[PDB]
């Protein structure tokens, strides 16, 4: 777990490491991100859709599709 607090949390931490990498493995199926998608990750990991959005753009630009 290694949670910073019993309730409510900020960016970074173990949850942050998984919100990011999990998206890399879970958004492969669906190329297009959405507020609902960011919101789901934001809620389970305790991060804000804005920070979540930062990864979403990053994972899509790093993976790339066709060249």
Curated annotation (Swiss-Prot):
Disruption outcome: Weak posterior-directed transformations in all 3 thoracic segments and in the anterior segments of the abdomen.
Signal peptide interval: none
Organism: Drosophila melanogaster
Subunit structure: Interacts with Ubx and hth.
Reported tissue expression: Prior to full germband retraction it is ubiquitously present, after germband retraction, mostly present in the anterior portion of the ventral nerve cord.
Gene that this sequence comes from: exd
Residues of the full protein shown: 238 to 300 of 376
Subcellular location: Nucleus
Protein name: Homeobox protein extradenticle
Family to which this protein belongs: Belongs to the TALE/PBX homeobox family.
């Amino acid at each position: 777990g290694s949670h910073m607090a019993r309730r409510k949390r900020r960016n970074f931490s173990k949850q942050a490491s998984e919100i990011l990498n999990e998206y890399f493995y879970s958004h492969l199926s669906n190329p297009y991100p959405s507020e609902e998608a960011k919101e789901e990750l934001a809620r389970k990991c305790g991060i804000t859709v804005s920070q979540v959005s930062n990864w979403f753009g990053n994972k899509r630009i790093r993976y790339k599709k066709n060249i």
